[PDB]
Design a protein around this motif. Structure first.
Motif, PDB file in Angstrom:
ATOM      1  N   UNK A  14       9.854  21.236   3.559  1.00 32.96           N
ATOM      2  CA  UNK A  14       9.579  22.482   4.267  1.00 32.96           C
ATOM      3  C   UNK A  14       9.422  23.628   3.269  1.00 32.96           C
ATOM      4  N   UNK A  15       8.275  24.332   3.319  1.00 32.57           N
ATOM      5  CA  UNK A  15       8.087  25.539   2.510  1.00 32.57           C
ATOM      6  C   UNK A  15       9.041  26.665   2.905  1.00 32.57           C
ATOM      7  N   UNK A  16       9.297  27.568   1.965  1.00 30.18           N
ATOM      8  CA  UNK A  16      10.534  28.339   1.923  1.00 30.18           C
ATOM      9  C   UNK A  16      10.599  29.383   3.035  1.00 30.18           C
ATOM     10  N   UNK A  17       9.425  29.833   3.474  1.00 33.61           N
ATOM     11  CA  UNK A  17       9.291  30.779   4.582  1.00 33.61           C
ATOM     12  C   UNK A  17       9.775  30.184   5.903  1.00 33.61           C
ATOM     13  N   UNK A  18       9.561  28.881   6.077  1.00 32.07           N
ATOM     14  CA  UNK A  18       9.867  28.197   7.333  1.00 32.07           C
ATOM     15  C   UNK A  18      11.322  27.720   7.403  1.00 32.07           C
ATOM     16  N   UNK A  19      12.048  27.866   6.296  1.00 32.07           N
ATOM     17  CA  UNK A  19      13.418  27.361   6.183  1.00 32.07           C
ATOM     18  C   UNK A  19      14.430  28.331   6.784  1.00 32.07           C
ATOM     19  N   UNK A  20      15.532  27.790   7.298  1.00 33.62           N
ATOM     20  CA  UNK A  20      16.643  28.619   7.757  1.00 33.62           C
ATOM     21  C   UNK A  20      17.548  29.023   6.603  1.00 33.62           C
ATOM     22  N   UNK A  21      17.510  30.309   6.270  1.00 33.49           N
ATOM     23  CA  UNK A  21      18.060  30.815   5.018  1.00 33.49           C
ATOM     24  C   UNK A  21      18.852  32.084   5.286  1.00 33.49           C
ATOM     25  N   UNK A  22      19.989  32.219   4.612  1.00 37.39           N
ATOM     26  CA  UNK A  22      20.858  33.373   4.803  1.00 37.39           C
ATOM     27  C   UNK A  22      20.947  34.210   3.533  1.00 37.39           C
ATOM     28  N   UNK A  23      20.759  35.520   3.679  1.00 39.27           N
ATOM     29  CA  UNK A  23      21.070  36.484   2.620  1.00 39.27           C
ATOM     30  C   UNK A  23      22.551  36.462   2.254  1.00 39.27           C
ATOM     31  N   UNK A  24      22.846  36.733   0.984  1.00 41.91           N
ATOM     32  CA  UNK A  24      24.225  36.832   0.505  1.00 41.91           C
ATOM     33  C   UNK A  24      24.961  38.032   1.102  1.00 41.91           C
ATOM     34  N   UNK A  25      24.224  39.115   1.335  1.00 40.21           N
ATOM     35  CA  UNK A  25      24.793  40.348   1.872  1.00 40.21           C
ATOM     36  C   UNK A  25      24.701  40.417   3.399  1.00 40.21           C
ATOM     37  N   UNK A  26      24.221  39.335   4.015  1.00 39.58           N
ATOM     38  CA  UNK A  26      24.555  39.003   5.401  1.00 39.58           C
ATOM     39  C   UNK A  26      26.065  39.035   5.635  1.00 39.58           C
ATOM     40  N   UNK A  27      26.463  39.706   6.711  1.00 38.94           N
ATOM     41  CA  UNK A  27      27.846  39.695   7.175  1.00 38.94           C
ATOM     42  C   UNK A  27      28.016  38.750   8.371  1.00 38.94           C
ATOM     43  N   UNK A  28      29.078  37.949   8.344  1.00 34.52           N
ATOM     44  CA  UNK A  28      29.334  36.962   9.394  1.00 34.52           C
ATOM     45  C   UNK A  28      30.043  37.598  10.592  1.00 34.52           C
ATOM     46  N   UNK A  29      29.304  38.417  11.339  1.00 30.80           N
ATOM     47  CA  UNK A  29      29.715  38.842  12.680  1.00 30.80           C
ATOM     48  C   UNK A  29      29.475  37.753  13.728  1.00 30.80           C
ATOM     49  N   UNK A  30      29.766  38.077  14.987  1.00 25.10           N
ATOM     50  CA  UNK A  30      29.507  37.185  16.120  1.00 25.10           C
ATOM     51  C   UNK A  30      28.042  36.760  16.214  1.00 25.10           C
ATOM     52  N   UNK A  31      27.135  37.714  16.008  1.00 26.29           N
ATOM     53  CA  UNK A  31      25.697  37.471  16.114  1.00 26.29           C
ATOM     54  C   UNK A  31      25.153  36.555  15.033  1.00 26.29           C
ATOM     55  N   UNK A  32      25.634  36.741  13.805  1.00 30.49           N
ATOM     56  CA  UNK A  32      25.227  35.911  12.671  1.00 30.49           C
ATOM     57  C   UNK A  32      25.836  34.509  12.759  1.00 30.49           C
ATOM     58  N   UNK A  33      27.115  34.437  13.126  1.00 33.38           N
ATOM     59  CA  UNK A  33      27.809  33.158  13.268  1.00 33.38           C
ATOM     60  C   UNK A  33      27.179  32.275  14.342  1.00 33.38           C
ATOM     61  N   UNK A  34      26.857  32.875  15.486  1.00 30.79           N
ATOM     62  CA  UNK A  34      26.167  32.179  16.573  1.00 30.79           C
ATOM     63  C   UNK A  34      24.778  31.699  16.167  1.00 30.79           C
ATOM     64  N   UNK A  35      24.085  32.512  15.371  1.00 34.48           N
ATOM     65  CA  UNK A  35      22.799  32.136  14.788  1.00 34.48           C
ATOM     66  C   UNK A  35      22.914  30.891  13.910  1.00 34.48           C
ATOM     67  N   UNK A  36      23.987  30.824  13.124  1.00 32.94           N
ATOM     68  CA  UNK A  36      24.321  29.638  12.336  1.00 32.94           C
ATOM     69  C   UNK A  36      24.623  28.428  13.230  1.00 32.94           C
ATOM     70  N   UNK A  37      25.443  28.635  14.261  1.00 30.06           N
ATOM     71  CA  UNK A  37      25.753  27.591  15.245  1.00 30.06           C
ATOM     72  C   UNK A  37      24.500  27.051  15.938  1.00 30.06           C
ATOM     73  N   UNK A  38      23.592  27.957  16.301  1.00 32.93           N
ATOM     74  CA  UNK A  38      22.410  27.616  17.093  1.00 32.93           C
ATOM     75  C   UNK A  38      21.301  26.985  16.252  1.00 32.93           C
ATOM     76  N   UNK A  39      21.400  27.135  14.932  1.00 27.07           N
ATOM     77  CA  UNK A  39      20.336  26.738  14.006  1.00 27.07           C
ATOM     78  C   UNK A  39      20.139  25.223  13.960  1.00 27.07           C
ATOM     79  N   UNK A  40      21.224  24.484  14.175  1.00 27.60           N
ATOM     80  CA  UNK A  40      21.228  23.031  14.027  1.00 27.60           C
ATOM     81  C   UNK A  40      21.123  22.559  12.589  1.00 27.60           C
TER      82      UNK A  40
END
Lengths: 149, 156, 149, 156
Positions: free
Chosen positions: A22-48
């Motif tokens: 998979x080319x890098x644009x299409x990949x599920x990728x997280x910024x380092x300065x992403x904060x793990x709130x409810x919205x981000x954590x759920x996004x991780x959960x939902x990503x598969x």
């Protein structure tokens, strides 16, 4: 069915990691300065994805991985940034070259290296020094899919 | 972070390390790399990211000789490079000399390769020896520099 | 390597689900009256299963599945029991008979049914009515492992 | 929850449903099952888990005829069963009759099978017809009951 599958494993020694990444644009990728709130954590959960690349600044600069087991005792309320959680755990990065045949990578996943592999090629074209160019990602899951379809 | 591991190159009882640029965040592992390989000497051939002085306090001579991204070495920098090798393998016999550019994949290899050719490796063997254990090493210019290079064998 | 793998896919039409299942004691299984606190949630994270059986009372009585995407906006602090989260989402249960050959189950996973299959056999022996007896679980992952070792 | 779906059995313009025991928690889907298949009639042949009266208010006649887990039908229960079929296919032509035990895998099938044999299916065909679409249906006793059973053909 099984006859396609047999061909799949026979393909594994000609077909490269570049064919199947998979080319890098299409990949599920997280910024380092992403904060793990409810919205981000759920996004991780939902990503598969159980193994997610962490990048600084640009996507092609992958720094750590996040595994799901890393999320163990994050309070999503008190707002832990990803970069500190990546500092909690050693998850060593698995780099692969683009021309690597799929059986070599399949064995590399078997040998204990990360089930996410990230894909580079040598880059001559352009005036600078040669660099390794990030193309995207290939998984254990990706290589299995070559057999089982 | 992709940036490939320190490579030992030894040929004709002298020793080299090709390395990457560190950051200051990474830096003490990089210095632990160097003294594990037992370098006396570091040549920076890129620009400076990092404070040299933590490396220098560990007792490695750190030299900033930048030149252009993807260039041949200009004639001064190769001149001083070969003089440095003579003085430093005077200094410790069977020490290593570190070079890094950005990752060591580029203009740091060229200085090592050209030192191999001066010590009498043939040029094609020198390239393939580096490219064996550091993949995709030189570009088109620097290969053509290394082709057109002639030794007059000025080490010992 | 590849020659073992070919044999693996050829095995798929003789080898049954019973050969290759995990028995129910060894499975990662959650009670319905389990509450999703920090300790339980981390246990789920650390388990390395994305699909987990939920049971009432006895383990052989499997009622729902928990998927990881179900955990999306649980506060682990205010103490949500599993049974209410299983009521939030339909995840239909995939039952398989013990004598089912592995290629039939592999296609059953492909057809859209749950990547956890749960394994029953007919039970004549004993004086009552025949019942379906829960033996344990077999996954997509389990069947892939038959190929790739 | 493993407990296999309602199975329609039609033979010689009469109709059956083999079903499971519901709980009260499950119950309205079970009643929606029944009227989708258009049953007038439910025979419980296990003990009672659930209130019959929500099912009965939907206008299905619900009958509790328990007998022993894994038994043959005792002679009363088969007697009343065949009489019930006569009165209920009088009542609606081409309705269904539901039976359930625990899951329908056992003593509910036996009553349906024995009704097929009385209507002149041969006994081996009656077993295989049920076991085709409800897997592993009868046990050793109830197979031996169904073998040793003789019709005198007492439906119409």
């Amino acid at each position: 069915g099984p006859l396609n599958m047999i061909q799949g494993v026979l393909e594994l020694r000609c077909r490269t990691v570049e064919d199947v990444l998979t080319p890098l644009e299409d990949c599920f990728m997280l910024d380092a300065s992403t904060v793990l709130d409810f919205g981000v954590l759920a996004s991780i959960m939902q990503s598969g994805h159980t193994r997610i690349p962490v990048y600084e600044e640009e996507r092609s600069n992958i720094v750590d991985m996040l595994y799901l087991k890393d999320l163990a005792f994050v309070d999503p309320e008190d707002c832990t940034p990803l970069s500190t959680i990546t500092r909690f755990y050693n998850h060593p990065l698995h780099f692969v070259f683009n021309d690597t045949k799929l059986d070599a990578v399949l064995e590399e996943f078997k040998r204990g290296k990360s089930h996410l592999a990230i894909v580079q090629k040598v880059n001559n074209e352009g005036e600078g020094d040669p660099f390794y160019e990030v193309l995207g990602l290939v998984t254990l899951e990706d290589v299995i899919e070559e057999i089982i379809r | 972070m992709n940036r490939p591991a320190p490579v030992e190159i030894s040929y004709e009882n002298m020793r080299f390390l090709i390395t990457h640029n560190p950051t200051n965040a990474t830096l003490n592992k990089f210095t632990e790399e160097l003294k594990k390989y037992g370098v006396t000497t570091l040549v920076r051939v890129c620009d400076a990211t990092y404070d040299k002085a933590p490396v220098e306090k560990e007792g490695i001579h750190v030299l900033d000789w930048p030149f252009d991204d993807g260039a041949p070495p200009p004639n001064q920098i190769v001149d001083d490079w070969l003089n440095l090798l003579k003085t430093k393998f005077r200094e410790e016999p069977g020490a290593a000399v570190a070079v890094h550019c950005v990752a060591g994949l580029g203009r740091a290899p060229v200085l090592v390769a050209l030192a191999l050719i001066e010590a009498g490796m043939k040029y094609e063997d020198a390239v393939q020896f580096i490219r064996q254990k550091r993949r995709g090493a030189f570009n088109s210019k620097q290969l053509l520099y290394l082709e057109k290079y002639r030794p007059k064998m000025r080490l010992r």
